[PDB]
Design a protein around this ligand. Sequence first.
Ligand SMILES: [Co+2]
Ligand SMILES: [Co+2]
Ligand SMILES: [Co+2]
Lengths: 160, 160
Amino acid sequence: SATTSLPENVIMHTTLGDIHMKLYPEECPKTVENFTTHCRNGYYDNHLFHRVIRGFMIQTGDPLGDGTGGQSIWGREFEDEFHKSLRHDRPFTLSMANAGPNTNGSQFFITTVATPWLDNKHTVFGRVVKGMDVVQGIEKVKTDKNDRPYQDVKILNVTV
Amino acid sequence: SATTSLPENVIMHTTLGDIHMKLYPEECPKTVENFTTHCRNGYYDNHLFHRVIRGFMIQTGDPLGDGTGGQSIWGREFEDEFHKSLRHDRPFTLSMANAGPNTNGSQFFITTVATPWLDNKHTVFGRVVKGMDVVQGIEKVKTDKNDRPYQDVKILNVTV
Ligand SMILES: [Co+2]
Ligand SMILES: [Co+2]
Ligand SMILES: [Co+2]
């Protein structure tokens, strides 16, 4: 119970600019710890935005760059952290990608519109506060039939 | 003689923000080729700004992080490329650090003031066009007696 405060702001540097995000550690302590420890350790450095769907979201955080990889800082998938106060109810929410209940690893996505059909299915754990235009820039790049950008867009590093 | 155009703009992402720089490939083709090839290949990723002197300049580009390391893309130090039209005559010029004539490797610095005593001793090969305030931010961090920041400031990546 004596511990250290979780980070609640990060700056994600990407190929197309910087995305500043606020996080919700009080509501989502496991999800924020997983994310910020990965950030601090460079886990996300050079990861692709491997799945980009205009009018929906951009998804990243896979070391394999194709949706099949990544792990939590605990080496095991971990639980969802849903809250009624945290909804995909505005654009640029930060949420965990997954493969069904309690399968959280490292992959995450940022929406470009409200996505209420993801409520109580994906952990909402932050939102973009600066660089929304960079999210929109990534959102519009040309992609192949599997929604993968022709030209790589990468996380360069996420600070704090 | 048939070749490919050298890049003439880069975006250097750092711990404290992004520094956009224009380069002078027509005047300094070897220096710009060395720099931009290192950039594209990630050579400078995670390099410290290991020498920061307020009111003067910030220096980086050493894999060893202490001034003793780094190499050109040719594995040998290469020649100075001086021109009378390129001077340290305004703040935020981009130049090669070195250890005497024709000892260029990978390390470079950005000035925060005009530094005319470096003219015809260091290759001037670009200048900052956006993010001057980030240069000034790095310039003012607390340093030890050897001008090394107490808190690491890093190049994260330099695009194009
Ligand atoms: Co940046
Ligand atoms: Co914006
Ligand atoms: Co290289």
